[PDB]
Design a protein around this nucleic acid. Structure first.
Length: 88
DNA sequence: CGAACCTGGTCTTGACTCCATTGCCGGATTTGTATTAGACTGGCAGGGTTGCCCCGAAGCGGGCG
């Protein structure tokens, strides 16, 4: 982003492997989301019985999980599920 | 027949005054968003009844040998 202005000229190998890292991060993000979808279902399974549909509850839990993997930190050394349960 | 008057709408002006129209400001309340770090990771209406249409075995008769 700070390179897209006239910050620096683009070397070929540096450009292509920084593109590889930038594309790899999104695949890792999607991998984490696709991992914890089951936790989302296991949390949403008990808020039924009033008003909304079960798939709607699951989808809003998915959106909360996207927010949780946005604002998740690992240097506190805790498991992901205890942090994401709150946001879901 | 001429003058004075009474009272008809007719109309101006000066003063009062009163209430809507913004307008600001301070506060109260009301609505909307972000954040909570132990670990937790795949459910439940539901069937039953009645009636009608579409494809598959099967005789089977005609073409085939």
């Amino acid at each position: 982003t700070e390179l897209s202005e006239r910050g620096e000229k683009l070397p070929a190998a540096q450009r292509r492997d920084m593109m590889w890292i930038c594309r790899d991060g999104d695949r890792a993000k999607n991998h984490l989301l696709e991992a914890n979808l089951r936790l989302v279902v296991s949390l949403a399974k008990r808020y039924t019985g009033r008003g909304m549909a079960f798939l709607d509850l699951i989808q809003e839990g998915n959106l909360g999980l996207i927010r949780a993997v946005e604002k998740f930190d690992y240097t506190k050394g805790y498991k992901f599920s205890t942090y994401a349960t709150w946001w879901i």
